[PDB]
Structures are given as structure tokens and as C-alpha cells.
Design a protein around this motif. Sequence first.
Motif, PDB file in Angstrom:
ATOM      1  N   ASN B 304       0.932  -1.265   0.113  1.00 37.19           N
ATOM      2  CA  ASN B 304      -0.067  -0.173  -0.179  1.00 37.19           C
ATOM      3  C   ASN B 304       0.960   1.224   0.004  1.00 37.19           C
ATOM      4  O   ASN B 304       2.046   1.155   0.256  1.00 37.19           O
ATOM      5  N   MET B 305       0.238   2.434  -0.284  1.00 35.49           N
ATOM      6  CA  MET B 305       0.899   3.736  -0.750  1.00 35.49           C
ATOM      7  C   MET B 305       1.531   4.169   0.754  1.00 35.49           C
ATOM      8  O   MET B 305       0.949   3.860   2.096  1.00 35.49           O
ATOM      9  N   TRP B 310       0.251  10.310   0.636  1.00 41.21           N
ATOM     10  CA  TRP B 310      -0.989  10.777   0.805  1.00 41.21           C
ATOM     11  C   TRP B 310      -0.820  12.383   1.360  1.00 41.21           C
ATOM     12  O   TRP B 310      -1.606  13.138   0.931  1.00 41.21           O
TER      13      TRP B 310
HETATM   14  C1  NAG Z   1      -0.171   0.250   5.040  1.00 39.36           C
HETATM   15  O1  NAG Z   1      -0.490  -1.154   5.499  1.00 39.36           O
HETATM   16  C2  NAG Z   1       0.083  -1.549   6.695  1.00 39.36           C
HETATM   17  C3  NAG Z   1      -0.060  -2.774   7.130  1.00 39.36           C
HETATM   18  O2  NAG Z   1      -1.159  -3.324   6.597  1.00 39.36           O
HETATM   19  C4  NAG Z   1      -0.692  -0.363   7.807  1.00 39.36           C
HETATM   20  O3  NAG Z   1      -0.059  -0.534   9.011  1.00 39.36           O
HETATM   21  C5  NAG Z   1      -0.586   1.133   7.307  1.00 39.36           C
HETATM   22  O4  NAG Z   1      -1.266   1.906   8.258  1.00 39.36           O
HETATM   23  C6  NAG Z   1      -1.168   1.138   5.799  1.00 39.36           C
HETATM   24  N1  NAG Z   1      -0.947   2.510   5.573  1.00 39.36           N
HETATM   25  C7  NAG Z   1      -1.969   3.493   5.257  1.00 39.36           C
HETATM   26  C8  NAG Z   1      -1.626   4.984   4.746  1.00 39.36           C
HETATM   27  O5  NAG Z   1      -3.111   3.080   5.942  1.00 39.36           O
END
Ligand code: NAG
Lengths: 198, 596
Positions: B304-305, B310
Motif C-alpha cells: 500500500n501507499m 498521501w
Molecule cells: C499500509 O499497510 C500497513 C500494514 O497493513 C498499515 O499498518 C498502514 O497503516 C497502511 N498505510 C496506510 C496509509 O493506511
Amino acid sequence: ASVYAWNRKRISNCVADYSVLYNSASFSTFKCYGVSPTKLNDLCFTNVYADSFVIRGDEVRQIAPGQTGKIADYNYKLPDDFTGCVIAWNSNNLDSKVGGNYNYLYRLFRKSNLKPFERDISTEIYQAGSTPCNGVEGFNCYFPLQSYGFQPTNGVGYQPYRVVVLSFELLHAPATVCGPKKSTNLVKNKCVNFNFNG
Amino acid sequence: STIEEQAKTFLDKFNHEAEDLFYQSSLASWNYNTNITEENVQNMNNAGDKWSAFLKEQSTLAQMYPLQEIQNLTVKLQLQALQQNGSSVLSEDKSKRLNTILNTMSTIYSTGKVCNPDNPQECLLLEPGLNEIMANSLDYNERLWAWESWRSEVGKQLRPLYEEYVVLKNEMARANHYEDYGDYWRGDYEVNGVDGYDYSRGQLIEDVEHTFEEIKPLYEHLHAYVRAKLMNAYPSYISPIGCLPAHLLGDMWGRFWTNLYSLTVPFGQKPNIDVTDAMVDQAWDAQRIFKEAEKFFVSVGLPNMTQGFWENSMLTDPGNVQKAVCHPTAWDLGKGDFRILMCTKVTMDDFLTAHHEMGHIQYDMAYAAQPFLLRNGANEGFHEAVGEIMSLSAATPKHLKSIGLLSPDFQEDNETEINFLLKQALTIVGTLPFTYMLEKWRWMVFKGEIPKDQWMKKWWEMKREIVGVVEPVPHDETYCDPASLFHVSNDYSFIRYYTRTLYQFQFQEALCQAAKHEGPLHKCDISNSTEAGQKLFNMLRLGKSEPWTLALENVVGAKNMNVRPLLNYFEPLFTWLKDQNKNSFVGWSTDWSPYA
Ligand SMILES: *[C@@H]1O[C@H](CO)[C@@H](O)[C@H](O)[C@H]1NC(C)=O
Ligand SMILES: *[C@@H]1O[C@H](CO)[C@@H](O)[C@H](O)[C@H]1NC(C)=O
Ligand SMILES: *[C@@H]1O[C@H](CO)[C@@H](O)[C@H](O)[C@H]1NC(C)=O
Ligand SMILES: *[C@@H]1O[C@H](CO)[C@@H](O)[C@H](O)[C@H]1NC(C)=O
Ligand SMILES: *[C@@H]1O[C@H](CO)[C@@H](O)[C@H](O)[C@H]1NC(C)=O
Ligand SMILES: *[C@@H]1O[C@H](CO)[C@@H](O)[C@H](O)[C@H]1NC(C)=O
């Protein structure tokens, strides 16, 4: 301090409360090697070595026994038989400026890997080639110290991380860095098991 | 000690210095693109001059290490990339002339304004003044006026400039031990030193012709169907036996045919799969669009980003006070900084573009572990292809139903699949002969097969032979009709779209076989499949460290670009077009039968 010239503070003749550090939410890495955090607050040690430096986000993994990299080989080397804890936390708020914070240096080249707990502050030109450097950075001769670029918009693997490594050793001298002596309220006129100063 | 260790330490020094300098240059370019102001232009120019001077000094240092005494493939690849002279081998006067020519072509293309003689009080620029007219008008002489007037002004300005450009670029390329500038562009796909997986510069043209010979029946049937529909739209101009008139293809140059979907729709009575109204009714912000795209990429198993994505991206048009480039671009600024600059509207096109650019971002994030000079695609085709596969997967009705954007009671019959496949063919299949003809013409111009006095006589001959498009009126050698397009006027390779189009469907077949989809290829969705994401990430993590042939072996199991996945994707549409072309005549005549 910079990782090439990491600060070492010797901690002696006091009470070290490790539960304050362990229960903090401000630390990203609290990886302990050779001892568990739960029994740190009970045991006693002769001296505590606190090594402090700043590295990148991706370089926190290299602060461990048996690892390989630029930091381990040329900047800060940990022994395999190391007892202590590696604590790291993100410092993008403090150590990053909008122009770019280039005040943190790291050693990029050395002929051989560092010994455990060694500091190298030499600023002699690295000789990668047969030709003599003669003190000038030309061809095959590079300056070993390079600046870190710390910007607030960088990724988490490039953001500055402050690392404090605590080294616990026991020597034949009387151990004086002890954990907190916990106490309970005094109860009188009853048959109780008392523990007064050992 | 040894030469290889010397090169390794030099490459480490280059990577560490270059990453910070590239981050400064990229941040200046970002600040120019999100904020068009003159001091940002000056900062961009200063950073670019520092970056180019640093690359010149590091290439000068890099050449002193000979290539044949290094055996490690990654070190040899970085040294090969660094030791290229570029324009530095050319003389300073001719290098300055080439840079001046490139800048003035950029200004002529960007600030080119053309309007009708005897009505000069206001004029229309190419974007969006002429684009909207080309994409939406139904009048023959208005489109003819716009096309001929823009090729008159732009070609008569750019023809001596292009005549100087070809000579200077050929001089630079032959000074760099290439046959021509076309060989310099084909050297991106050159693999040397790998046993079995070697690819030659001369094999690229043969592979393109071999794939295009299999493209040709599908394009002939599509051209016949589009010819019949444009004959219905314009009654007397189009001949049953001849080529299509050039100004009627729905775009300025004929790059895409996607603006002819209204005229050439098979079943207008049946509904469309347009999801725009559904997002408008539920008030979907562009932030929700990018979060749904992120949900798609975490469903397949990709990372994920970042938080910096963001925080630092501009996903909405800023306003009147702040100026920004409207073109969607994903930026790998360096040091783990990934951003998307897109003026996102609530449309299907912007949603698919968001998936495409987040695919670009995922590709950039995957090779972040690689050294700096290897942080690229294995070729120029893969980088766009990994975004185009996301554009394929996100456009499916199954993906729209899964995310709730399409009604669960939408009837998926064969007619909607036929018209969707025809729209995808007008976008995707229609650009292939134009791309192949343009690149083959440019290769023959650089090679010297076509003399300067015979550029256009051959070019229209190529366009009738390959694209099946006839000129409205004949053009002499005072015109420069190719250089009215963005990529050719600004020194960009064009075979990346052909390779991207074939790699797109090859990757699509590979991931759908990984995801165990059991239906048609165009009905396939790669969400919820961890193994498809793993198969993708195996190639994605390599970057430019491995050859593109070995990467293609890693994905599809083949050592060469293949044309069969594209034909398998459009096979229902191919049978439907063969059924619909019974009365009409497939193929065209190169004679002047419609109009000249
Ligand atoms: C991306 O994924 C990780 C693990 O799943 C998580 O802890 C993190 O908060 C996520 N990033 C966002 C911007 O939500
Ligand atoms: C864009 O530039 C203008 C003028 O140079 C400035 O006032 C504005 O703050 C800039 N926008 C951002 C987001 O920094
Ligand atoms: C090539 O160099 C890279 C880094 O310099 C190293 O990780 C890799 O193992 C080397 N490969 C070979 C075959 O020596
Ligand atoms: C770059 O130009 C110099 C100057 O002629 C030449 O010696 C060198 O071989 C060139 N580099 C390559 C890779 O051909
Ligand atoms: C769709 O299927 C029906 C029934 O098989 C058939 O009559 C019709 O012609 C088909 N239409 C297309 C466009 O394939
Ligand atoms: C894929 O996973 C998401 C997460 O639960 C789910 O909402 C979605 O329905 C799944 N896709 C399909 C086709 O079931």
C-alpha cells in the motif's frame, strides 16, 4: 552524533529504570539481543554503554549481531556475542529541514571491516586503486565521509532514525547499575515476610 | 585493487551522490509542475544544469574503467548506462544548436496557436481548443480546415528545424558508434552478455514486422467496419474501396480511434457500462478513487501507499490562483518519495488513469531496493505495460460490481461485451499500425533510406499501405506532418507504445492464468489473487537489473514478444467483425479513389 563518530556515554553509579523506556510509545524499535526486557528491571550490571547516532530508515536492520552492510562494516560494528538492546525511533520532525539536513555524515569506504565497538574518525582519503591518492580526491581516490540527505518529505526507509544501543557487561568489579528496588507499603503488628535491604 | 572493485566503489559513490542530486532536481521539477511560476522555472533550470553537469563529470570518470574486465552483470549494466556520451561526444557548437532546436520545437508545439484566415481576432491552441473540435465535430470541412491549417502552420515552421534535427541526431549517433539515431533508440532493447537471452538491435524490426503481419487481418476487418460506419456518418466522402480521410479519425493525428465510439457503436439501443453517474450520486471524491485503487492493489498482495504519498500528492486541481500541468504523471522523486500529479475529475477515464498511475507508483516502489542507476524498467515497454494491465483489470464490469460502482442486476450479455471490446480495440488495436508506420518511417529517415526531397511522397505511401489512411489534398515537401505530434517534436521514442500494447496482453494472460480465471480473457479480474501479485512482484522487484527477455520468461514463460494474447483477447470481436464484414469489402486500395 554521526554514525561514523557515534557518541558513547558510560552510565555508572545509578538506578536504571528500564520499564520507562520499554512502556514508551515513542520508540519504533526496541529489539533486545541476549536478554529479555522483562528481567532488565531486576538485574544489575557493572556499567552500561549507551551509543547514540543517527542513521537512515533502511539501515536500522543492520544494527544487529551478524549483519552486513555499510553501517556494520564501516561505521558501527556489533559483536556476535552481544548482550544489550537496540532502541531506534523516527526523528523526521527534528533531524529533517526543508532545505535538506546535511549535518549527518557516514563513512562510506574503509579497507577492512571494523572491530566490535570501534570508532573510526579518520578523514584520510580512501585508496581504491594502485595509484597514490597524495591527499587529494581525484581518480580511484574518494573521500570516505559522505553527508546524509534528510528531507521531511522522504519515505520511511529514508527518514532519519535516532538509534541508542545499550551494551550490558558484567565485570569482576562490583556491579553498581542496578534495576529499581521496588517497595510496598509497610504493615505492622502482623506475621509477614519482611525483606529489608536484602 | 582490481578494476571491478574500483568500478564498484565508484558506482557506490555515484549512487549516493546522484540519489540526493536527483532528489533535488526531481523536487524542483515537482515544484515547477504543481506551481508554474518563473522562480520555479529558474530553480528547475538550475537543478537540471547541475544534474547534467554532474552526469557529464561522472560519465567522464566512468569511461576510464573498461567494460570487458568486469564479469558481474549488474555492475556491467550500470557501467554501460553511465559510460554513454549522450550529446557530449558532439561539438559544443552543434550541441548548443541541438539544444536550441529542441527548446524551440518545445515552444512551437506548446505555444502553437492556429485559427482561420480573415478571422484572426481570437485563436485556439491545440489543447483543449483543437482537441475538442477534432473529438466532437461532425462537419467535414471544419475538421478539414482545422487539420490542414494546423499542419500548414506547424509543418512550415518545423520542416527546416526537423531537417537540421535529423542530421544532428545522426551525427551524434554515429559519433556514439551507432548506425543511426534509430539504432540508438533500438539499443534500449539490446541485451548483450547473457547466455541465450541476448537480443539484438536488428532483431527488433524483424519482430515488429512478424507481429504486425498477424495484426494485419484484425486491423483490416476493423478498418473495413470503421470505413462502413464513417460512410454512414459522412455519405459521399468515403469510398467503399479506398482509404479513410485523415481528418475524420476522431483525433488530431490519428493516434487513437476512441472518439469514434459514438459513431461506430454496434448496439446503441443496449446500455453502456458508464459508472460516472453512480459516483456522482454517491459523491465519490478523488481521494475515494485513490483509496479504492489502493484497496485493489492490497487485494492482489502489493504494498500500500506510503504516508508521504498521501501527504505530498496533488490529486485535485488546486484552483485559479495556482497553476499546474493538467497531464496525469506519476513521479518517483527518489529516496522513497512517490507522488501522483493528476487533475482528477469524477469520470471513468480519470479512475482508470488513477489505476494506471498507481500502477506506475507500485512499479517505482518495487525496485526501490535496487541501486540508483538500475532503478528503471527492464525496457521502456514494461513501465507503461504494468499501468496498462491495471487499466485493463479496473475497467472490467466484475471490478465495478465488486467495488459497488455497478448495479448487481446489470445483465452481461454478448452485445455489451462486443461493444466494450470494440471500444478497447479502437483505443488499443487502432494505434498499432499508426505507431509501427511512424517508427518505421523515422527509422528509414535516420537510416537514409528516404532522401529529404522524398520524405512525404514515401510517407503517404506508407500511410496508405499500412494505416489505410489517405491524405485529403496532396502535400509537398514544405510540410512537416509527422512533427505535429508531441513525442516526435520533443525527441521521444515511439516503439514503447507498440511493445507496451503487446506486453499488456501478454501480462494479462499470465496473471489471469495465475489467478485461474476460467472464462474469456476480457472478463478476467486480477483482484483477490495473492499468487498473481507474487508473479507480478517477481518481475517488479528486478527493475533494470535483469534483461527484459529474462523478465518476460519470469512472467509469461517466453523469451520474446508475442502477438497471440492480443488476438486471443479480441477473438469474440474478431469473429463478430468477420460476420459483420460479409457485404462490405475488407482491405483498402492505395489509389486516390475517395478524395485527393
Ligand atoms: C499500509 O499497510 C500497513 C500494514 O497493513 C498499515 O499498518 C498502514 O497503516 C497502511 N498505510 C496506510 C496509509 O493506511
Ligand atoms: C504557489 O506559488 C505561489 C506564488 O509563487 C505561492 O503563493 C503559493 O503558496 C504556492 N503554492 C503552494 C502550495 O506552495
Ligand atoms: C554483483 O554486485 C552486487 C552488488 O555490487 C552483488 O550484490 C552481487 O552479488 C554481485 N553478483 C555477482 C555474480 O558477483
Ligand atoms: C565517449 O566519447 C569519447 C571521446 O571520443 C570516447 O573515447 C569514448 O569511447 C566514448 N564512449 C563510448 C562508450 O563509446
Ligand atoms: C448473442 O447471442 C444470441 C444467442 O446465441 C445470438 O442470437 C446473437 O446473435 C448474439 N449476438 C452477438 C453480438 O454475438
Ligand atoms: C476481494 O476482497 C475484498 C475484501 O473483502 C472483497 O470486498 C471483494 O468482494 C473481493 N472480491 C470478490 C470478487 O469477491
